[PDB]
């Protein structure tokens, strides 16, 4: 009972550790690059919208 619960807690930590082992690839930089490029593209349309509104 108590021992099984303690085992489950350590299992949770183990699962977190293995998921972090996968996550440590450091490839998130490319995805962040894509996100930043998309954000810049979206912000670009702001100038066109402002120009259209002014006219």
């Amino acid at each position: 009972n108590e021992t099984l619960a303690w085992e489950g807690v350590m299992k949770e930590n183990y699962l977190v550790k293995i998921n972090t082992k996968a996550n440590d690839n450091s490839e998130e930089m490319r995805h962040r690059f894509r996100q930043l490029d998309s954000k810049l593209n979206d912000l670009k349309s702001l100038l066109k919208e402002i120009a259209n509104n002014i006219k």
Binding site: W6, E7, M10, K11, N13, Y14
Partner: protein, 512 residues
């Protein structure tokens, strides 16, 4: 004339759609769960591309998996011919259905109705299983079949499907790839009704135009730029008419869908079709309020992220027992990710795993072949836990620990991801891994099939490694607790603790 190298018939435009559908269904074909229709320019000249070949091959694979009907021109001209080839290829490796619709006047050779056959303008396709011809008249007049084709689709769409999902209706998705004069007319007449179409933003000139659009001067400029030859040849008077069609096509965008050019994933076609059908069902507005049917529809396809974001939303009533049926189907439907989503979104697994549901699952869905294999294996070896597991399965077929029963059921059918998902919930985590490794190693040496032995050995090794790592970390955390766990024996999991199972399965690494 019926020729074997399916029935080929010549039909008048006055033929009733209801009678034709009744014949097709009752006599030869089975119930249709989906209709994929491809519209391309009737011109024989065409250019293939690598991406188009891959896309159409994947479309054929999806249609075969679902069992949808395919309707095309079937004039043995260019793209259509390739489609037929693909069908034949899949026939070499229960059967695909491909209906081709053409006109009698186009056919170069005519043979009167035993069976009359001929081996060989616009020669008909050779790989299409079923073909029909329009015999209204005007042998020299082309483009007569179109009308009838439309009448065939709509009657099917409006008729009740009497099948699960889509609110008792049928998909009837319309497809577009390539540019042609009649493509615009076909798309417009399809969109006139509640028939969503998806247009590939690739080689298709008109498809590229439509994708780019999503003013009259702007539309005219785009059309002129994309198709200089056709626009230059065509008179100015007709152009105005074309514009009208475009407007309608662009006026309603919820039905219209387009495939992104940048996307290169394998499942792009399925994603597009699922999204289009979801848009149509949601915007129907007849049953938009409900969420059970929409959730089931999105579950039929493997669109987990979209289903989550849409159905579950935030601060939305999730209900306590609403997920019961959907997750039951997911367990039957082999959708591990949906099962995980249901478990982590609020579902209570302990309450669901009732005696009745487990009995139903073990009584019918259990594979008969697996049952016979387990019986013969138990007869051959009959180890300490083989009798226990066999007795449990027999009892359910006719301190309960249902979770272990579900885990054993998942393992016995060789499901990796689902087995791991179930494992992440068990109480006796380590002992279950050792037991599964022993169970797989028992069958690893069957020798009847070479491939399954390799897969089973790999799964057993993975489970063994997981157990070793878990126990290593557990011991590195606390020493006395780890020893206590070792000596501890579960609640009649198999009547044995981890050490006994490890030694029995000659697990040298774990003991070392």
């Amino acid at each position: 004339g019926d020729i074997q190298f399916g029935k080929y018939l010549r039909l008048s435009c006055d033929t009733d759609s209801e009678t034709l559908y009744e014949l097709l269904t009752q006599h030869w074909h089975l119930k249709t769960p989906n209709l994929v229709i491809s519209v391309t320019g009737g011109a024989k000249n065409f250019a293939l591309k690598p991406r188009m070949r891959k896309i159409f091959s994947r479309l054929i694979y999806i249609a075969q998996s679902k069992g949808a009907w395919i309707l095309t021109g079937g004039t043995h001209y260019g793209l259509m011919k390739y489609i037929g080839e693909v069908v034949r290829d899949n026939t070499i490796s229960e059967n695909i259905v491909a209906i081709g619709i053409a006109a009698w006047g186009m056919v170069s050779n005519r043979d009167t109705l035993f069976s009359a056959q001929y081996i060989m303008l616009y020669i008909l396709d050779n790989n299409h299983t079923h073909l029909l011809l329009v015999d209204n008249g005007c042998h020299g007049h082309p483009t007569v079949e179109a009308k009838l084709r439309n009448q065939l689709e709509k009657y099917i769409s409006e008729r009740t499907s009497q099948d699960s999902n889509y609110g008792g209706k049928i998909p009837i998705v319309c497809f577009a790839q390539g540019g042609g004069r009649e493509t615009l007319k076909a798309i417009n007449t399809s969109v006139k009704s509640k028939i969503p179409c998806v247009v590939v933003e690739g080689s298709g000139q008109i498809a590229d135009v439509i994708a780019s659009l999503v003013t009259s001067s702007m539309v005219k400029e785009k059309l002129v730029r994309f198709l200089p030859r056709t626009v230059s040849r065509l008179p100015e008077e007709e152009i105005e008419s074309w514009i009208k069609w475009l407007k309608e096509i662009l006026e309603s965008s919820h039905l219209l869908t387009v495939i992104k050019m940048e996307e290169a994933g394998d499942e792009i076609v399925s994603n597009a079709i699922s999204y289009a059908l979801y848009k149509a069902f949601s915007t129907n507005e007849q049953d938009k309020d409900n969420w059970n049917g929409q959730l089931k529809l999105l579950l039929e396809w493997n669109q987990l992220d979209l289903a989550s974001d849409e159905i579950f939303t935030n601060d939305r009533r999730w209900e306590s027992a609403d997920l019961q049926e959907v997750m039951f189907t997911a367990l039957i439907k082999d959708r591990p990710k949906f099962v995980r989503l249901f478990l982590e979104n609020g579902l209570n697994l302990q309450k669901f795993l009732t005696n009745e549901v487990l009995t139903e699952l073990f009584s019918t869905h259990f594979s008969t072949l697996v049952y016979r294999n387990l019986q013969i294996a138990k007869n051959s070896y009959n180890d300490a836990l083989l009798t226990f597991v066999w007795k449990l399965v027999a009892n359910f077929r006719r301190t309960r620990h249902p979770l272990q029963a579900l885990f054993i059921w998942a393992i016995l059918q060789n499901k990796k991801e689902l087995s791991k998902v179930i494992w992440e919930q068990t109480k006796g985590c380590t002992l279950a891994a050792l037991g599964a490794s022993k169970l797989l190693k028992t069958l690893a040496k069957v020798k009847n099939d070479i491939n399954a032995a390799g897969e089973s050995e790999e799964l057993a090794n993975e489970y063994e490694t997981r157990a070793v790592e878990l126990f290593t970390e557990c011991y590195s955390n606390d020493e006395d607790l780890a020893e206590q766990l070792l000596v501890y024996s579960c609640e009649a999991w198999g009547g044995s603790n981890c050490l006994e199972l490890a030694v029995e399965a000659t697990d040298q690494h774990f003991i070392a």
